[PDB]
Amino acid sequence: SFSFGGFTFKRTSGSSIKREEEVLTGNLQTLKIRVHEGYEEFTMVGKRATAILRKATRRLVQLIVSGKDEQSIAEAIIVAMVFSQEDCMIKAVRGDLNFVNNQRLNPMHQLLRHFQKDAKVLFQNWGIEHIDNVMGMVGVLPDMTPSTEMSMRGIRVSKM
Amino acid sequence: SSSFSFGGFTFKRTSGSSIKREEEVLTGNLQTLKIRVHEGYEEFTMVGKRATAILRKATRRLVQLIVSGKDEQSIAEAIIVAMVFSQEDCMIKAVRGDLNFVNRANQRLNPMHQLLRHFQKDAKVLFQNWGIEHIDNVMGMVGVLPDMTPSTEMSMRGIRVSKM
Amino acid sequence: ISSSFSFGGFTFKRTSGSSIKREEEVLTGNLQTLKIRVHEGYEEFTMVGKRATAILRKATRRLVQLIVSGKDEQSIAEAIIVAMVFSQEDCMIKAVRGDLNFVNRANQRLNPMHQLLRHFQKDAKVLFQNWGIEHIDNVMGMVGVLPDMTPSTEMSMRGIRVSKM
Amino acid sequence: SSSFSFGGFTFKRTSGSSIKREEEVLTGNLQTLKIRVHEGYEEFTMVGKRATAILRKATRRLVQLIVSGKDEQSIAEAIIVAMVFSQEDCMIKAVRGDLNFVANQRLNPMHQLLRHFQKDAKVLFQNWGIEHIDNVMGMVGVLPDMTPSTEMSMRGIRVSKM
Amino acid sequence: SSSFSFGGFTFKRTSGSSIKREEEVLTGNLQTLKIRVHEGYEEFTMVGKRATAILRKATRRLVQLIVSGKDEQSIAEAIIVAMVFSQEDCMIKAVRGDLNFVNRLNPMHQLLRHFQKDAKVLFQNWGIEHIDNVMGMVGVLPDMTPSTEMSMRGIRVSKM
Ligand SMILES: CN1CN([C@@H]2O[C@H](COP(=O)(O)OP(=O)(O)OP(=O)(O)O)[C@@H](O)[C@H]2O)c2nc(N)[nH]c(=O)c21
Ligand SMILES: CN1CN([C@@H]2O[C@H](COP(=O)(O)OP(=O)(O)OP(=O)(O)O)[C@@H](O)[C@H]2O)c2nc(N)[nH]c(=O)c21
Ligand SMILES: CN1CN([C@@H]2O[C@H](COP(=O)(O)OP(=O)(O)OP(=O)(O)O)[C@@H](O)[C@H]2O)c2nc(N)[nH]c(=O)c21
Ligand SMILES: CN1CN([C@@H]2O[C@H](COP(=O)(O)OP(=O)(O)OP(=O)(O)O)[C@@H](O)[C@H]2O)c2nc(N)[nH]c(=O)c21
Ligand SMILES: CN1CN([C@@H]2O[C@H](COP(=O)(O)OP(=O)(O)OP(=O)(O)O)[C@@H](O)[C@H]2O)c2nc(N)[nH]c(=O)c21
Numbered sequence: 001s002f003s004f005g006g007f008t009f010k011r012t013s014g015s016s017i018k019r020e021e022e023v024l025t026g027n028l029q030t031l032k033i034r035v036h037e038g039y040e041e042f043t044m045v046g047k048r049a050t051a052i053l054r055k056a057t058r059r060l061v062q063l064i065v066s067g068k069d070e071q072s073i074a075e076a077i078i079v080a081m082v083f084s085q086e087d088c089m090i091k092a093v094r095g096d097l098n099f100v101n102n103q104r105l106n107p108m109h110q111l112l113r114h115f116q117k118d119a120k121v122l123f124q125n126w127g128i129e130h131i132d133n134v135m136g137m138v139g140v141l142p143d144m145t146p147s148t149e150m151s152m153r154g155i156r157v158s159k160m
Numbered sequence: 161s162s163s164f165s166f167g168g169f170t171f172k173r174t175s176g177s178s179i180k181r182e183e184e185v186l187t188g189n190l191q192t193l194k195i196r197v198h199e200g201y202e203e204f205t206m207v208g209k210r211a212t213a214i215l216r217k218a219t220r221r222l223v224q225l226i227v228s229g230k231d232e233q234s235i236a237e238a239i240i241v242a243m244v245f246s247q248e249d250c251m252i253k254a255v256r257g258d259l260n261f262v263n264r265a266n267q268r269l270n271p272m273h274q275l276l277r278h279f280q281k282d283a284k285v286l287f288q289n290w291g292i293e294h295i296d297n298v299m300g301m302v303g304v305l306p307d308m309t310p311s312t313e314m315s316m317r318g319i320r321v322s323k324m
Numbered sequence: 325i326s327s328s329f330s331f332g333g334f335t336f337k338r339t340s341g342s343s344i345k346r347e348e349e350v351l352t353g354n355l356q357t358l359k360i361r362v363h364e365g366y367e368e369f370t371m372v373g374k375r376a377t378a379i380l381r382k383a384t385r386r387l388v389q390l391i392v393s394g395k396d397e398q399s400i401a402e403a404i405i406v407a408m409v410f411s412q413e414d415c416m417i418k419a420v421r422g423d424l425n426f427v428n429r430a431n432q433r434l435n436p437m438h439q440l441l442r443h444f445q446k447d448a449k450v451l452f453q454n455w456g457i458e459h460i461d462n463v464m465g466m467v468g469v470l471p472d473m474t475p476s477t478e479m480s481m482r483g484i485r486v487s488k489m
Numbered sequence: 490s491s492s493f494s495f496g497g498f499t500f501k502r503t504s505g506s507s508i509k510r511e512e513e514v515l516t517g518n519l520q521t522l523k524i525r526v527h528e529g530y531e532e533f534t535m536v537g538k539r540a541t542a543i544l545r546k547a548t549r550r551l552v553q554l555i556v557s558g559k560d561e562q563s564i565a566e567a568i569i570v571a572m573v574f575s576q577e578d579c580m581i582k583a584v585r586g587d588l589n590f591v592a593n594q595r596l597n598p599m600h601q602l603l604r605h606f607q608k609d610a611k612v613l614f615q616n617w618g619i620e621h622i623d624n625v626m627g628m629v630g631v632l633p634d635m636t637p638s639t640e641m642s643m644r645g646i647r648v649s650k651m
Numbered sequence: 652s653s654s655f656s657f658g659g660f661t662f663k664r665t666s667g668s669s670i671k672r673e674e675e676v677l678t679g680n681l682q683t684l685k686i687r688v689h690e691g692y693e694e695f696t697m698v699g700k701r702a703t704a705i706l707r708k709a710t711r712r713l714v715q716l717i718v719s720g721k722d723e724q725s726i727a728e729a730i731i732v733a734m735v736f737s738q739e740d741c742m743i744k745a746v747r748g749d750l751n752f753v754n755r756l757n758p759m760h761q762l763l764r765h766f767q768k769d770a771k772v773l774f775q776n777w778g779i780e781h782i783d784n785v786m787g788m789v790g791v792l793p794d795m796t797p798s799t800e801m802s803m804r805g806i807r808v809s810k811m
Contacts, residue, residue, distance in 0.1 A: 048190075049190070050186075050190050066186050066190060067190075068188070068190070068512075069512040069513050069514065070512075070513065070514045070515050071512075071514060071515060071521050072513070074515060074519075118519070119519055120518075120519050123519075128677060132351050133414065134351065135418070143517065143519070144515045144519065145582070150677070158186070159249065160183070160184065160185055160186050175470065175474070175476070175479075176470055176471070176472065176474075177453075177470075177471060178453065179449055179450065179453050199450075199453045199454055200452075200453035200454075200471055201457040201470060201479060216479075218457045219454065223457070223459075284508055285508065285528070288506070288507060288508050288528040288529035288548070289529075291547075292530035292547045292552070305504070305505055305506075305530060306505070306506060306530065307505070307506045309504070311504070314504075314530060314545075340792065340796070340798070340801075341794065341796075342775075342793060342794040343775060344771050344772065344775050364772070364775040364776050365774075365775035365776075365793050366775075366779040366792060366793060366801060381801075383778075383779045384775070384776060388779070612670065612690070614691075615668075615669060615670050615690040615691035615692075615710065616690055616691075616710055618709075619709045632666065632667055632668075632692055633668065633691050633692060634667065634668040634691075636666065636667075638666070641666075641692060641714075
């Protein structure tokens with residue numbers, strides 16, 4: 001149990017080792033981040049959203065989100081994309097990362113605030129996939145619009 | 161026929177049948193409820209002390225409800241009970257806050273009665289978010305708005321009040 | 325061309341339309357992958373069995389309409405089951421409970437479509453109860469039919485009618 | 490009865506009621522707006538200087554609108570106000586670019602939306618939805634370019650000939 | 652933008668208007684096409700050598716088409732052009748394989764040439780509807796057989 005981007009995570013399944021790694025942003029900035037290695041399954045519980053995150057080494061496997069509005073769902077998705085530590089998320093940063101709280105934030109909270117400010121490049125470069133339509137699951141598009149046919153890769157919105 | 165009691169009404173099934181399946185659903189406050197979802201078309205009469213009704217229902221869907229009652233408050237009580245009984249998502253999503261009702265003997269009410277008592281205390285969110293529809297003029301019957309005002313032009317989706 | 329064939333104990337004869345095929349992976353109600361050849365296009369068929377006959381309109385993974393004429397309600401139900409399976413609809417595939425592992429007399433797996441057919445012939449309750457119900461118009465010579473096979477002049481399983489002729 | 494002013498029109502509620510729920514929604518440019526979403530069926534008359542209307546509305550949905558006006562501009566102004574007022578998701582997704590309207594006082598989200606669409610209704614009108622209409626005497630349909638039609642109309646929108 | 656040639660047909664707009672927005676669409680094969688999407692209700696007459704038509708269209712939607720033609724192939728040619736021109740998602744999803752046509756054609760002419768070569772996937776997947784009996788007009792099936800009971804969604808053939 002822990003906390004990240006306004007969400008309480010609880011690992012329900014799996015495990016990982018934490019490995020320090022330098023990554024490179026889409027503006028060619030160098031970040032030192034603690035990379036988690038292994039398949040994991042989390043419960044995410046926020047104030048206006050909840051999600052099930054299944055996850056591997058630098059890869060989002062599946063996110064199933066419920067929320068009280070459009071914004072809250074968009075928050076969970078962003079948090080989960082940052083949390084996954086995926087390189088296409090890291091490559092989607094535009095400009096330099098200079099966020100402050102006058103103290104300088106850590107690389108993960110740096111990427112989190114950047115995408116919370118503008119999610120558009122993140123969403124529009126993540127990738128679309130054809131969906132199956134299993135029970136109670138709808139797709140969400142890069143413009144936050146729902147779909148029964150296409151979705152952002154590994155991202156589902158629960159209608160349950 | 162098979163009879164049961166729910167929400168102060170006797171239901172007797174007059175058409176159709178159903179199977180049950182356990183599903184996890186999420187309230188408007190994002191609380192998990194384990195309910196037995198009934199699957200299939202069914203028709204019921206509902207008989208209470210001050211109102212009666214005919215209900216058609218399908219899998220988590222109120223198809224149609226006609227209520228006959230002594231007064232508007234009894235009619236509302238019947239609509240509430242039918243809407244909860246339908247197991248509809250927009251009913252479940254109309255829940256505000258957590259559900260923690262208990263009985264005299266200190267036993268946690270089951271999920272369906274949890275929803276029932278919640279909406280028996282206050283049905284504003286449920287009624288206002290249920291859906292409104294255009295209706296045809298049919299003699300002997302009227303539409304009803306969320307504030308329980310009769311209407312010959314509009315009605316809460318699938319809900320009618322008998323003038324007989 | 326596939327305009328004439330046997331399926332589920334019924335002779336199908338195409339009377340309108342045409343189709344193309346595309347091999348597709350569908351997911352059952354127990355998360356089992358089935359490789360089926362999906363027929364794309366509007367088609368109309370007569371179905372002729374020993375105890376029932378029907379007219380079927382179908383499109384891409386959709387039963388458009390079915391009218392069944394039969395000797396008894398059990399035979400009528402058999403025809404409805406076959407037409408629903410044949411339609412390749414997602415709600416039929418999602419109505420599968422458990423894994424499908426049917427075998428013939430010689431010990432081979434049946435193909436996916438016969439896998440689905442034998443499942444629903446064993447028990448069609450989930451299929452019928454989850455298919456969808458609709459309000460019908462009064463049309464003389466025809467009635468609706470409920471999942472429990474009771475005739476109805478008011479409601480019917482979606483797109484399904486029973487002939488009184 | 491209940492009244493307020495919005496977009497230069499006096500709204501008077503003639504049927505129905507609503508409750509409010511504060512929500513956050515995303516524009517067609519992913520800008521977050523915090524709005525109070527009104528829930529429930531309501532009918533209003535709208536009275537302006539150059540047009541009047543009857544509006545039916547439900548939760549984030551324009552059910553139907555009939556407008557009577559002195560000319561095409563006045564009729565359009567009423568349609569724009571009714572679409573923004575409805576709080577429809579397709580209206581919010583029609584927003585192009587960021588909203589920063591500003592006495593120098595930054596407008597609330599609803600007036601943010603109103604001012605944007607009073608400037609440029611093209612995206613709003615062209616994306617709203619079109620429908621085939623029945624012939625009803627005393628009434629016509631209206632196309633996005635404000636041309637009257639007896640065959641098609643912007644979804645739920647009619648112009649009175651009275 | 653109210654008078655032009657497309658697919659061998661002169662289009663003349665008779666009602667409505669549109670705006671354009673450049674967008675990225677995905678083919679049934681996952682090939683990205685950059686197209687200028689026209690937004691708004693418009694009505695056109697289409698005049699070719701061997702067929703004429705009236706077309707109502709909206710944002711990426713064929714509302715209705717009526718075709719008058721000398722024979723089955725000329726009627727089919729007009730239907731194909733109208734369906735491509737409509738910019739519908741189910742036209743784009745009916746594409747099989749990659750598009751690489753050269754005279755390198757723009758996206759819309761890429762789509763057109765592809766469906767002029769093989770309309771089978773497009774016609775079979777377009778959608779079928781029940782129809783009303785209207786004298787002077789018939790339905791048409793994907794195989795181009797006339798029908799007085801069913802038709803490809805929104806498509807009619809004039810008997811005048
Ligand atoms: C990506 N993360 C992050 N994380 C946990 O998230 C919590 C808060 O993240 P943080 O504040 O950005 O970093 P920090 O406190 O320095 O810890 P860390 O360096 O391990 O990420 C930490 O307790 C960390 O262990 C994770 N925990 C598990 N189990 N799997 C993961 O993939 C991840
Ligand atoms: C939603 N329900 C509920 N219900 C019946 O309503 C009564 C009260 O519901 P309950 O408090 O959930 O009791 P329980 O026995 O746990 O419910 P169930 O039968 O669904 O398992 C019971 O007699 C139950 O059988 C129903 N009966 C029919 N025929 N169709 C239905 O959709 C439903
Ligand atoms: C779903 N089907 C099945 N089918 C035909 O039904 C017959 C028996 O079905 P099958 O043995 O389960 O399928 P099979 O022979 O493996 O292959 P296929 O479905 O690709 O034709 C075959 O001749 C097949 O062509 C069909 N024929 C037409 N015309 N339209 C259809 O939708 C379908
Ligand atoms: C969408 N609206 C807006 N609205 C009312 O229209 C007026 C102008 O809206 P506004 O500028 O957003 O003011 P505000 O007080 O923030 O709106 P609200 O009361 O929704 O929080 C206010 O009196 C507001 O109460 C409404 N009144 C009713 N009855 N039904 C509605 O759907 C709506
Ligand atoms: C889909 N189209 C296409 N089109 C016009 O059709 C003609 C041929 O289109 P084209 O060969 O794809 O070239 P192009 O200029 O790239 O088309 P566009 O306008 O989409 O950018 C052009 O003059 C174009 O403006 C249209 N004109 C109107 N009025 N409405 C429409 O929906 C469409």
